Write a protein that binds this ligand. Sequence first.
Ligand code: SF4
Ligand SMILES: [Mg+2]
Ligand SMILES: [Mg+2]
Ligand SMILES: [Mg+2]
Ligand SMILES: [Mg+2]
Ligand SMILES: [Mg+2]
Ligand SMILES: [Mg+2]
Ligand SMILES: [Mg+2]
Ligand SMILES: [Mg+2]
Ligand SMILES: [Mg+2]
Ligand SMILES: [Mg+2]
Ligand SMILES: [Mg+2]
Ligand SMILES: [Mg+2]
Ligand SMILES: [Mg+2]
Ligand SMILES: [Mg+2]
Ligand SMILES: [Mg+2]
Ligand SMILES: [Mg+2]
Ligand SMILES: [Mg+2]
Ligand SMILES: [Mg+2]
Ligand SMILES: [Mg+2]
Ligand SMILES: [Mg+2]
Ligand SMILES: [Mg+2]
Ligand SMILES: [Mg+2]
Ligand SMILES: [Mg+2]
Ligand SMILES: [Mg+2]
Ligand SMILES: [Mg+2]
Ligand SMILES: [Mg+2]
Ligand SMILES: [Mg+2]
Ligand SMILES: [Mg+2]
Ligand SMILES: [Mg+2]
Ligand SMILES: [Mg+2]
Ligand SMILES: [Mg+2]
Ligand SMILES: [Mg+2]
Ligand SMILES: [Mg+2]
Ligand SMILES: [Mg+2]
Ligand SMILES: [Mg+2]
Ligand SMILES: [Mg+2]
Ligand SMILES: [Mg+2]
Ligand SMILES: [Mg+2]
Ligand SMILES: [Mg+2]
Ligand SMILES: [Mg+2]
Ligand SMILES: [Mg+2]
Ligand SMILES: [Mg+2]
Ligand SMILES: [Mg+2]
Ligand SMILES: [Mg+2]
Ligand SMILES: [Mg+2]
Ligand SMILES: [Mg+2]
Ligand SMILES: [Mg+2]
Ligand SMILES: [Mg+2]
Ligand SMILES: [Mg+2]
Ligand SMILES: [Mg+2]
Ligand SMILES: [Mg+2]
Ligand SMILES: [Mg+2]
Ligand SMILES: [Mg+2]
Ligand SMILES: [Mg+2]
Ligand SMILES: [Mg+2]
Ligand SMILES: [Mg+2]
Ligand SMILES: [Mg+2]
Ligand SMILES: [Mg+2]
Ligand SMILES: [Mg+2]
Ligand SMILES: [Mg+2]
Ligand SMILES: [Mg+2]
Ligand SMILES: [Mg+2]
Ligand SMILES: [Mg+2]
Ligand SMILES: [Mg+2]
Ligand SMILES: [Mg+2]
Ligand SMILES: [Mg+2]
Ligand SMILES: [Mg+2]
Ligand SMILES: [Mg+2]
Ligand SMILES: [Mg+2]
Ligand SMILES: [Mg+2]
Ligand SMILES: [Mg+2]
Lengths: 208, 137, 99, 121, 149, 82
Amino acid sequence: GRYIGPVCRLCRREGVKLYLKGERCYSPKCAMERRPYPPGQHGQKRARRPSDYAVRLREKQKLRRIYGISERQFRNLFEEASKKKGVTGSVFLGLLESRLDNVVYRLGFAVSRRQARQLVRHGHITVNGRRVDLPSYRVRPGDEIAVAEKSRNLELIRQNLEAMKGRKVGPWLSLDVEGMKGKFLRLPDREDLALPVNEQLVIEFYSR
Amino acid sequence: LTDPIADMLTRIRNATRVYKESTDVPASRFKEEILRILAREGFIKGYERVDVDGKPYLRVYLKYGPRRQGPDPRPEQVIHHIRRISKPGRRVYVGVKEIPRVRRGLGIAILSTSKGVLTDREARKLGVGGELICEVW
Amino acid sequence: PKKVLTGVVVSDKMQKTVTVLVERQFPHPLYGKVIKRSKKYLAHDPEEKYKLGDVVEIIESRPISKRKRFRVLRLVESGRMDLVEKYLIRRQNYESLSK
Amino acid sequence: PTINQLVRKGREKVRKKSKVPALKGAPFRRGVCTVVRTVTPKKPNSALRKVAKVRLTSGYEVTAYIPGEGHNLQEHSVVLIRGGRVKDLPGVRYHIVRGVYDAAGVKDRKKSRSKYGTKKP
Amino acid sequence: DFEEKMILIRRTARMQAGGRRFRFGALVVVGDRQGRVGLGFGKAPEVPLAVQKAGYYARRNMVEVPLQNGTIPHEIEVEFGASKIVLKPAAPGTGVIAGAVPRAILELAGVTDILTKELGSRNPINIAYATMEALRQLRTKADVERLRK
Amino acid sequence: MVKIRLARFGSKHNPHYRIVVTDARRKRDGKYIEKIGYYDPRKTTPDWLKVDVERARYWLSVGAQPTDTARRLLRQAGVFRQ
RNA sequence: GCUAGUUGGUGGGGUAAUGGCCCACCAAGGCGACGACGGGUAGCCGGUCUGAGAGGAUGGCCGGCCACAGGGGCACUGAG
RNA sequence: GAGGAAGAAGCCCUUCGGGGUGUAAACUCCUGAACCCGGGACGAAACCCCCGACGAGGGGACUGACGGUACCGGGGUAAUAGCGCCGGCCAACUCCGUGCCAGCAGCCGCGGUAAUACGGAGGGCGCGAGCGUUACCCGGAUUCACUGGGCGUAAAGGGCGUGUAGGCGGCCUGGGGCGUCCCAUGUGAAAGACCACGGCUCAACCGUGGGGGAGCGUGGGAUACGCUCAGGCUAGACGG
RNA sequence: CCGAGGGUAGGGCCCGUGACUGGGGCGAAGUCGUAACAAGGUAGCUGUACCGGAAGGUGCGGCUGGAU
Ligand code: SF4
Ligand SMILES: [Mg+2]
Ligand SMILES: [Mg+2]
Ligand SMILES: [Mg+2]
Ligand SMILES: [Mg+2]
Ligand SMILES: [Mg+2]
Ligand SMILES: [Mg+2]
Ligand SMILES: [Mg+2]
Ligand SMILES: [Mg+2]
Ligand SMILES: [Mg+2]
Ligand SMILES: [Mg+2]
Ligand SMILES: [Mg+2]
Ligand SMILES: [Mg+2]
Ligand SMILES: [Mg+2]
Ligand SMILES: [Mg+2]
Ligand SMILES: [Mg+2]
Ligand SMILES: [Mg+2]
Ligand SMILES: [Mg+2]
Ligand SMILES: [Mg+2]
Ligand SMILES: [Mg+2]
Ligand SMILES: [Mg+2]
Ligand SMILES: [Mg+2]
Ligand SMILES: [Mg+2]
Ligand SMILES: [Mg+2]
Ligand SMILES: [Mg+2]
Ligand SMILES: [Mg+2]
Ligand SMILES: [Mg+2]
Ligand SMILES: [Mg+2]
Ligand SMILES: [Mg+2]
Ligand SMILES: [Mg+2]
Ligand SMILES: [Mg+2]
Ligand SMILES: [Mg+2]
Ligand SMILES: [Mg+2]
Ligand SMILES: [Mg+2]
Ligand SMILES: [Mg+2]
Ligand SMILES: [Mg+2]
Ligand SMILES: [Mg+2]
Ligand SMILES: [Mg+2]
Ligand SMILES: [Mg+2]
Ligand SMILES: [Mg+2]
Ligand SMILES: [Mg+2]
Ligand SMILES: [Mg+2]
Ligand SMILES: [Mg+2]
Ligand SMILES: [Mg+2]
Ligand SMILES: [Mg+2]
Ligand SMILES: [Mg+2]
Ligand SMILES: [Mg+2]
Ligand SMILES: [Mg+2]
Ligand SMILES: [Mg+2]
Ligand SMILES: [Mg+2]
Ligand SMILES: [Mg+2]
Ligand SMILES: [Mg+2]
Ligand SMILES: [Mg+2]
Ligand SMILES: [Mg+2]
Ligand SMILES: [Mg+2]
Ligand SMILES: [Mg+2]
Ligand SMILES: [Mg+2]
Ligand SMILES: [Mg+2]
Ligand SMILES: [Mg+2]
Ligand SMILES: [Mg+2]
Ligand SMILES: [Mg+2]
Ligand SMILES: [Mg+2]
Ligand SMILES: [Mg+2]
Ligand SMILES: [Mg+2]
Ligand SMILES: [Mg+2]
Ligand SMILES: [Mg+2]
Ligand SMILES: [Mg+2]
Ligand SMILES: [Mg+2]
Ligand SMILES: [Mg+2]
Ligand SMILES: [Mg+2]
Ligand SMILES: [Mg+2]
Ligand SMILES: [Mg+2]
């Protein structure tokens, strides 16, 4: 299904922080703040020159591991974005950002995309009233994302919305902490996402 | 001789590649139409009708760029490339929707259509097609 | 509509029948060059008006026999023995192609 | 060639040749071993490579390589063969599949077990 | 100053009484990703000296590369001693579709979207020279109209 | 004889019928002479029944015999209305 | 190189109907290097896979047409 | 799922100081696939009967294999992971064992006592209910080159003439309009491909609508070019 | 009368196989010589003819992809 093993080793391999854990990522004990070298026996040896294929593969793997999506789904989404009219990198980023689990992670109902996946799957999230239990559901502009009425009195949800009363969501989103409900206004822009990714490298990787 | 049009284009290419001022070609009306198209598009300065040994000839006046600085000071060309498309051994016809775009719009294609000898842009504006004579850029 | 072809009479040795050589042109499907092909048709000629060298028009018709599904519609021109000569020379050249 | 020459004669397509004709269009073939022996490779390699003479269901009789360390094949063993030549052995074009019919899997194999037909320990 | 990309390293040999003696050749491309690109081929008894000399030669031979929206103004086909390069503009999302040598040359020049193909001989040095020539022959519409009218 | 009937399309547990005019000996999902309407028995859509009234009138006028379900659907769409 | 019902004509038989489809007689024609004849292989198409395109390969399922119903031949009934 | 050690034990490596597996585990908190209880489908309104006139148009009833299934509500446990690869191409490296043996191999090639290439182990990379292998097709192969190749020495000019079919052909004027081009119209079924909308909680899948589309028939138009007919010219060719 | 099929006789083409016999490709070693690459120790190559264990030799003519 998905990757369910150790997750800081992914950050150490990619050489950058992929915020895949939530609170611990901003703590001093983040593994990228203590051992910023790749895992294994040879992580502290001098790095050799990366080939072009290595560079493009690492960039694509970074982008894929940020969202925790399998390679089959990732490639299907990429081909779909390439079919659409519009700059394929921006369209691909928008399609990735429209997944329900990512949307409820950004709205603040969860602290990590993994937790957002568990929230959506376990029937705690409703889109436009009806309950949706599929992380891959694609949110269209105007859709209302919210916590189920019987799930509002949940400790995890209560704490998550408490910790977000100060934090402000992106321009492409709206949140009502009192109303416990979100709103997807438009496709996110490429500048609105603080992604350590060059999408041209991903496109060139998939041209091979 | 088998291809007067290709022969004239070859005369122009050969004379241009040595930076001559003018070149002569045996006269004909179709050749005159092609030369008029070339002059209107700025690839040549012009052309005129003269007599050599009592025979009618067309004198074409070639045009070049400014002098260049360096190891090679020969001026750059205004006719970089000229090529015949339809040949006696293979005739090429295109409809109005098969009209090629040469050099993304910097080059031209010459067409023989029922409305006359036109540039590709001219033929597209008139919505007509025909034989493809040559491409120039 | 009934197909009308135009050709030249190259054989009139049968009774009430003329062989008509019809030529057609078409561009080559892949190489683009225009090429010529020819085909012979046996055509019904009940009154035996048309002879060697005649350029005539024939029209698709009800079967008159085997191999005979066209009828001579009208005469186009006469005195075209040169086309017949081309066909006969081409046929004669085959005798030297054997082994 | 000229356009007219191409019209007269055209361009000739390329016909490929099968390297595994004894398979007769199948991915695998069953056979019976008649001779099991060892052969020596060509220069520069030096070894004693284990091969079997196999009479197949398709009517041919071929030589097949036995991969892996140690085998239990002998005369009248039933085997499955697949395509793939052994470079340094003359005339050997097929591989015995380990773990099928009378060809046991490689004992004590720990890596790449889907090849060599060894169950998970 | 410019970004530096090392395209090729190789060791060549000559013979004398005693045996073979080696030399190193470095092909290096220098550019600022804004319209300037240059190529240099340096030979030296040692690799770092070869790279330094290649960069020094590259900085002394640059082309202006008339970019427009990250692509080239028109398609171009250029031959250099049995090597052939074909370049074609593309839409803003295409990316750079090229082999390693043309990709390095075009990326350091500021090209973000292009379609390329290598034909004939695929020798890296001659392919790089052909790419440089093709970039040298690029003309915009203003250039051609300043030339014709 | 010519009949006006229902040809099944869609997928398993999701039937979608086309009201078509065809020869009676053709198999029910085979080629038809022409298509005049469509029907969705589950009514999952605001417009789950459409009929070309003029064409159905023409085909009825020349001797096409509808089936019971087809006749019912044509009556609902108002083909026999006077 | 092939062809002797072979190619054409006249009359007839047969068919829902044209026709050497079949028969009798008369003429000597018909086809072929634009590849006849012979040998090998093959159900054909809408489509499918691949490919930048041009092209190449392919015709499982689904829709259309054809052929066959143990291997051959034949007719009856019938609108078929 | 969240938190969770300058970081336990085991295992591997070490320059003997330590390094890695690794927040990974353990451990605490949270959620609740499987399971349990209850409810419960759509797909089925016609033919049929009554009135009206066995018409049009109104009224009523019967009919479920799938199936107690999908689904809904209320309870509820921390709950399968494997396969290939790690010399270059090609992403991912160390130790031990062996010693041209055993073995690996798609190509180049590895192995003959210090093997990143064989076997095992620790570690790593790629995918993941899959991962590999064999067979076949297209691609890469511009390596049958129409788009888009060549023939002095790399494979490739016939030993040389003459010439049949065929292919190609100078300048000017008019007619035809066969090729060629344009316009309208018929056909190019459905499904599939594309675009938009829509139904299954998404998706696959499906529905609706729209647009394309080579070729072919028909009617009309154009005549620059090719063809064809006719009349001229002398720069090609031939003759004196 | 035609007629599936069966029978008889003579041909054409193709496939498998055969005592024996001819060459070909290959080989981390054998026997005989040393023809070619240097003017390769007789410049080489070449068509043809004859000859010799073998590479090859010689005659006649040709080429330089040899020299002077
Ligand atoms: S704590 Fe740091 S290293 Fe670990 S998953 Fe979060 S961002 Fe990555
Ligand atoms: Mg031609
Ligand atoms: Mg013909
Ligand atoms: Mg014809
Ligand atoms: Mg008759
Ligand atoms: Mg013979
Ligand atoms: Mg030529
Ligand atoms: Mg070896
Ligand atoms: Mg493995
Ligand atoms: Mg070169
Ligand atoms: Mg070249
Ligand atoms: Mg090459
Ligand atoms: Mg008879
Ligand atoms: Mg007959
Ligand atoms: Mg006959
Ligand atoms: Mg088709
Ligand atoms: Mg495509
Ligand atoms: Mg295509
Ligand atoms: Mg079929
Ligand atoms: Mg059939
Ligand atoms: Mg049968
Ligand atoms: Mg049977
Ligand atoms: Mg009946
Ligand atoms: Mg009857
Ligand atoms: Mg955890
Ligand atoms: Mg129901
Ligand atoms: Mg129940
Ligand atoms: Mg529940
Ligand atoms: Mg590597
Ligand atoms: Mg090995
Ligand atoms: Mg292995
Ligand atoms: Mg060792
Ligand atoms: Mg390996
Ligand atoms: Mg190992
Ligand atoms: Mg591809
Ligand atoms: Mg290649
Ligand atoms: Mg190809
Ligand atoms: Mg290619
Ligand atoms: Mg070509
Ligand atoms: Mg070549
Ligand atoms: Mg040569
Ligand atoms: Mg040459
Ligand atoms: Mg040679
Ligand atoms: Mg060659
Ligand atoms: Mg040669
Ligand atoms: Mg010669
Ligand atoms: Mg020769
Ligand atoms: Mg001679
Ligand atoms: Mg001759
Ligand atoms: Mg001649
Ligand atoms: Mg001759
Ligand atoms: Mg001639
Ligand atoms: Mg016309
Ligand atoms: Mg259609
Ligand atoms: Mg929807
Ligand atoms: Mg549709
Ligand atoms: Mg018409
Ligand atoms: Mg002409
Ligand atoms: Mg004349
Ligand atoms: Mg034999
Ligand atoms: Mg000698
Ligand atoms: Mg010697
Ligand atoms: Mg010697
Ligand atoms: Mg010596
Ligand atoms: Mg000697
Ligand atoms: Mg000698
Ligand atoms: Mg000697
Ligand atoms: Mg010598
Ligand atoms: Mg010599
Ligand atoms: Mg001799
Ligand atoms: Mg003699
Ligand atoms: Mg002698």
